[PDB]
Amino acid sequence: GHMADQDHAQLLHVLGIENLRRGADGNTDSPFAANTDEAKANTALDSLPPLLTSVSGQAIASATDWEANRPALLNTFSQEIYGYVPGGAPELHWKAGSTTPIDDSGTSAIRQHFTSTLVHPENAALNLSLNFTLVLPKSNKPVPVVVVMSFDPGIWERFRDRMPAERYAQIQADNARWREQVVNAGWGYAEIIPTEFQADSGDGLSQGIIGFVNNGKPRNPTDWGALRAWAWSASQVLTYLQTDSRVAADRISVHGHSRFGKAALVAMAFDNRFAAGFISSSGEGGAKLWRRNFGEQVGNLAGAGEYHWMAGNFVKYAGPKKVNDIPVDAHQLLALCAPRPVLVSVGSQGESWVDPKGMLLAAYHATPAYALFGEQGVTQNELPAVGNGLLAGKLAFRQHEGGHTPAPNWETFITFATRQWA
Incomplete structure (x- = not known):
């Protein structure tokens, strides 16, 4: 969209940046196709920052030292990579409906929908309605709950009439299967659609929760982007879940896949209340080392198509x-x-x-x-x-x-x- 292009252009202007290096392409016939040759992927690994030097420049020699450095290390990830959560980010007050059994079988497993409404003090076009769905197996004790970030299923349905059918069937089967695996293990889950909190486009950076907090104005370059906002959204679900006596407060996990795998890892690192992380195929900006040259590249994430995932400041690295x-x-x-x-x-x-x-x-x-x-x-x-x-x-x-x-x-x-x- 043209608004992503405009905001991206204004961001480069604000940082004093003339040109970015192009991102990689995924098709192999292009001159810009991503390297997939292990022999060419490691040149930059010699600049890998020393894990065990603190930000103060001291040696980290104990669990205690690592925890003393953690806020400073997080601060670098905030300013330069993913962006700060602004203090203006609001508290979410949730309302719940009734519980309903997940199926007519007579299981005692239930489903419950939660809603938080945000009225903007200045501009009603920034109002938000935010949701998550809680699913709990029946238990006489508090159960672990995994917070799950999912792609909008309205997408599979928009394209149901245009898909190979073997593949639509397989996506639908996988989608049902993990729900059953979670409940059968005596876990519940809490599902959010992240793009309802913050759109997956530079077009939406003046909307969603980022726009709400920014009063619809453009981001400053140290402000959160979408990955951090999606992680923040997961963290707000955990905050609710730690007030619910049906939930084991020390066994709330986080999971996301692909771009949400990036976000889930951001959540895992920034919110140490999460008890475990299932980080799936996250890649560049997630668990992949930036300094690998293999697959997606920094220029992909600094470019107009994905920069919104990141702090504005990040684009300087391209x-x-x-x-x-x-x-x-x-x-x-x-x-x-x-x-x-x-x-x-x-x-x-x-x-x-x-x-x-x-x-x-x-x-x-x-x-x-x-x-x-x-x-x-x-x-x-x-x-x-x-x-x-x-x-x-x-x-x-x-x-x-x-x-x-x-x-x-x-x-x-x-x-x-x-x-x-x-």
Whole structure:
């Protein structure tokens, strides 16, 4: 849309940036196609920022030192990468309807819809109606709940009449399956559609929650973008869930896939109340190291089509700065989740855009922070055989046998979280 283009252009003007390097293309016949040749993907890894040097420039030698550095390290991710949550972000007050059984079987599993209304003090066109759906298995005790970020299912339906049908059937089956796997494990889930909180476009940056807080004005370059706002939305659901006696307050997980996998990891790192993370095929801007040249590139995320995911400040790393200059990398983002358990998940079929091994490497290079806490992580720097999970530490990696989908790793994640919480 033209508004994304206009805001992007004004952002470059505000940072004093003439040109950005192009992003990569995904089709291999293009001159700009992404590198997928492992031999050409590691030039920048020598500038990898030292995980265990604090922002003050001291050596980090203990769990205590890592926690003392955490706010400063988060602050760098806020100003330069994902943006600050403004203090003006409001409290969400939720109203719930009645519970209804999830199916007519006589299960005691229930569904309940929650709504929060925000009236803007100045401009009613910024008003918001925000939602999540809670699903709980029946239990005599508080149950774990995974906060789930989903793609708007109105999208599968808009295109039901135009899809191969084998594939529509398979998406619908996967969508039903994880819901059943969660409940059968004695977990509930709390589902949000993130794009109802903040649109997935620069067009919407003056709308949604970012626009509400900004009174419909353009972002300053240190303000949150969409990933951080989606993570904030998940965090507000966790805040509700910790007031609900049906929920185990120390076993609220977060999950998202693809662009929501990026957001879920941002949530995991920034909100240490989340008890476990299922981070699926997140890629560039998520668990993939920026300094890998493999699949999606910084120029993709600094460009008009995806910059809205990021702080405005981030686009400088595609222009007057290079990937080598990013003050942090994805191993520090995973490290920020320590000591809490995180599964980095990716498929094996058609996943080059997210760089399976660059995510592995992020976990590998994050692990010395988990080690400070007496915990284990990822200890090899090459991909295991597909399907062989590195599942023993609090920081874990499993590449499954499928494509760009989380469905083959829900079983692994639920089992993993249960074992790591014991």
